[PDB]
């Protein structure tokens with residue numbers, strides 16, 4: 001009768017409010033914290049009235065009518081959000097559709113800097129307001145963050161402050177915890193964005209195919225029926241969340257988590273751990289759960305997928321099922337392949353049946369179908385071993401450097417901050433994945449690269465600058481990585497005009513944390529490539545070494561700025577000669 005009552009009742013006041021805060025922060029990213037709290041409280045008050053009497057006026061309206069109406073009350077909307085006021089003239093679903101379309105993936109808000117005294121203080125004078133603020137700050141920075149999971153991370157954030165605010169060493173307890181929480185936020189943000197990007201750019205059939213492969217790897221003892229059931233339900237969950245319907249998404253997620261733990265015995269022995277937990281931790285745990293051991297009765301596949309004479313009829317009679325089945329089977333036995341590699345193999349199997357079934361004798365044609373997968377598998381294994389060798393020889397900083405050079409050559413039109421962010425994220429894939437046991441390196445690498453490349457695509461959507469990127473981003477989800485890997489120096493590119501200030505450093509740099517020093521150096525590196533696109537990697541590496549050396553010296557100096565001022569312009573001129 002009243003959706004708002006229903007969700008309120010299912011979720012309870014705490015989570016209802018939390019989720020409704022997230023929604024509003026993500027939709028209206030610039031509004032101050034206080035406006036949002038007020039709007040939340042109001043909606044929540046409405047919900048309570050409806051829970052008391054679902055016949056009451058307007059209680060029957062949809063959530064989005066209700067929430068969309070609420071957002072359209074904010075003061076200074078047309079000033080703050082010029083582009084959004086027009087959305088408020090529209091009805092639903094056209095309205096919500098407009099709000100979504102204008103969500104910002106790179107609002108470039110200030111970085112969230114742990115300030116342990118000020119924060120423990122604010123925490124103590126009002127913990128409820130302190131945690132709301134966290135949800136708000138994160139939601140706003142990541143307008144597609146998986147709602148339910150943000151509530152989860154908010155609990156971890158509360159545990160952090162609970163533990164550390166009364167400790168001997170406040171920052172010793174707290175700054176590493178919050179640094180690791182921020183890594184976990186960024187990674188989770190990037191996983192969820194890929195899901196919503198997959199719905200937007202490729203459709204639900206693409207999200208389902210990804211999720212069949214992934215969950216078949218994770219739960220290889222489950223049967224296909226069960227995998228499909230979970231994938232169907234998980235797909236709806238994310239479709240809701242990616243469409244800003246967070247209350248429905250949370251409720252539906254909890255139903256799923258219950259389902260999974262009721263049937264954990266016929267799903268995976270790894271879920272026991274997770275099913276013994278409170279709600280949000282449980283959901284988090286199932287979502288991140290490790291892959292089960294491979295059953296001893298995995299069926300040989302030749303017979304059904306290469307040898308049977310009826311394949312062409314079966315395939316024609318129901319393509320999506322026959323293929324989904326193939327994908328389930330192949331993926332469950334292949335936790336050692338990435339999801340994209342599995343999807344590229346499925347598309348080749350498909351392509352082989354399309355080809356062979358239109359020929360005179362299909363069975364002799366499709367008899368060698370499994371053999372066409374060999375090169376699909378070797379290419380990425382070889383790439384991962386090569387980049388991991390490099391990573392291990394040179395370390396994170398220089399691997400990031402190598403990737404920054406790589407990406408600037410491929411897309412020299414992209415802004416420097418994007419190239420640097422992206423080269424740095426790509427480089428961290430080496431740190432995450434290369435040290436893992438070797439059978440894990442390919443899946444770790446490609447699954448994480450999908451997250452980084454999607455980020456590039458998402459930023460590119462905002463600020464299109466290169467047709468090569470557009471094409472790689474939109475042609476084929478499964479082929480993205482190979483498509484990006486194949487790009488080379490854009491030759492059409494006119495070297496960017498030399499501007500000496502760009503390469504000109506000052507003593508300000510000396511006071512930065514290491515991190516931020518690297519970014520400054522890494523930004524100059526991209527600029528060196530834009531101006532000398534044909535310089536080799538070996539030349540850029542030497543020239544940047546000379547820049548680091550110079551920065552280290554001048555920062556070690558008696559009179560830092562005089563140092564920078566005398567030595568710098570010479571290095572700037574001479575380094576250009578060392579390039580292309």
Ligand SMILES: O=C(O)Cc1ccccc1Nc1c(Cl)cccc1Cl
Pocket residue numbers: 390394398399401402403405406536537538540541542544
């Ligand atoms: O770029 C690569 O693929 C690897 C490579 C090999 C030899 C020398 C330098 C580089 N990369 C690289 C670059 Cl392009 C700049 C600074 C530091 C490094 Cl390690």
Ligand SMILES: COc1ccc2cc([C@H](C)C(=O)O)ccc2c1
Pocket residue numbers: 205206209210319320321323324327343344346347476477478479
């Ligand atoms: C029913 O079977 C499938 C199998 C593989 C698929 C792969 C893809 C990828 C994401 C692609 O890039 O096209 C999509 C749909 C698919 C459906």
Ligand SMILES: COc1ccc2cc([C@H](C)C(=O)O)ccc2c1
Pocket residue numbers: 383384387388403406426427429430433434445449481484485486
């Ligand atoms: C194992 O570690 C990595 C890290 C970064 C990588 C980037 C690339 C890109 C897509 C490339 O353009 O080749 C490939 C492989 C990679 C492996």
